[PDB]
Amino acid sequence: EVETFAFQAEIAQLMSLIINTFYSNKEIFLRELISNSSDALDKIRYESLTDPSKLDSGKELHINLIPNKQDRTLTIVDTGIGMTKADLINNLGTIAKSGTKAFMEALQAGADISMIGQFGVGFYSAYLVAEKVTVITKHNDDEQYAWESSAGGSFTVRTDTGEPMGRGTKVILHLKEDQTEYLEERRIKEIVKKHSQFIGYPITLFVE
């Protein structure tokens, strides 16, 4: 059972903008994804302070970067708050309809694509390098779900019948053929050092 949904008009627009705008500084995608993983880890950390039973799905709060040259994928895994089916469907737990306006308005007002995060829509920068994005997620108050989109104005949601995660978000980037640099160890290492050098959680770059 696969559910297909239309993106909200503004989000669909933002996506085609990211896919069609000639913008060479694509590496900003990683900082945006790691920053979201950090935000998700801050949410579970804060919830765990009041009630410690929130960590009964995993105590480790971390970020893993998993390149795979065989499948042409870069996976960003976090052990953060995760998303419920409703969070996942609701513009991916954000005010993305509202935030898209502010960003598209700013792009006309001098600003460039690298400022996407400042409008809370940094996730869509994944489409600067990915031809398809799969988001596997698990929240404490729901089951495991897989969200997927190759853009084109729609996304799908299904329950994931794959490997249980415990809690957190797995962002699988199915990279475009000309974007395989983001699978190279030295290239990832350089991006993390340049943009994510002060994240408050361990970032592990897996080797092949």
Ligand X SMILES: Oc1ccc(-c2ccnn2-c2ccccc2Cl)c(O)c1
3-class DSSP state for residue 90? coil
Residue with nearest beta carbon to ligand X: 40
Q: Quote the CA–CA distance of 40 and 78 in Å, as a whole number.
A: 8
Residue closer to ligand X (CB basis): 76 or 191: 76
Q: Is 11 in the site for ligand X (CB under 6 A)?
A: no
Q: Which residues are annotated as a binding site for ATP?
A: 36, 78, 97, 123
Instruction: Supply the DSSP string of 91-127, one letter for each residue.
Output: TTTS-HHHHHHHHHHHHHTT--GGGGGGGT-GGGGGG
Residues 17-56 that bind ligand X (CB under 6 A): 33, 36-37, 39-40
165 is an interface residue for ligand X by CB under 6 A: no
**100 vs 66, 97, 113, 120, CA distance in Å?**
29, 6, 12, 8
CB of 33 to ligand X, least distance (A): 4
Query: Least distance to ligand X from the beta carbon of 56, Å?
Result: 18
Closest CA to 89 of 30, 149, 23: 149
Per the structure block, which two tokens stand in for 59?
């105590």
Q: How far is the CB of 39 from ligand X (least distance, A)?
A: 3
Residues 60-99 touching ligand X, rule: CB under 6 A, are 76, 78, 80-83, 92-94
Residue 129 near ligand X by CB under 6 A = no
SS3 content of the chain, % helix, strand, coil (to 5): 45, 25, 35
Report in angstroms how near the CB of residue 205 gets to ligand X at its nearest.
Answer: 17
- For the bound state, the minimum distance from the C-beta of residue 168 to ligand X, rounded and expressed in Å, comes to 7
| Strand order across the 144-149 sheet | 3-6, 154-159, 144-149, 130-138, 168-175, 73-78, 63-68, 203-205
Q: Does 157 bind ligand X (CB under 6 A)?
A: no
Query: Is the CB of 171 or the CB of 183 nearer to ligand X?
Result: 171
Q: For binding to ligand X (CB under 6 A), which residues are involved?
A: 33, 36-37, 39-40, 76, 78, 80-83, 92-94, 123, 169, 171
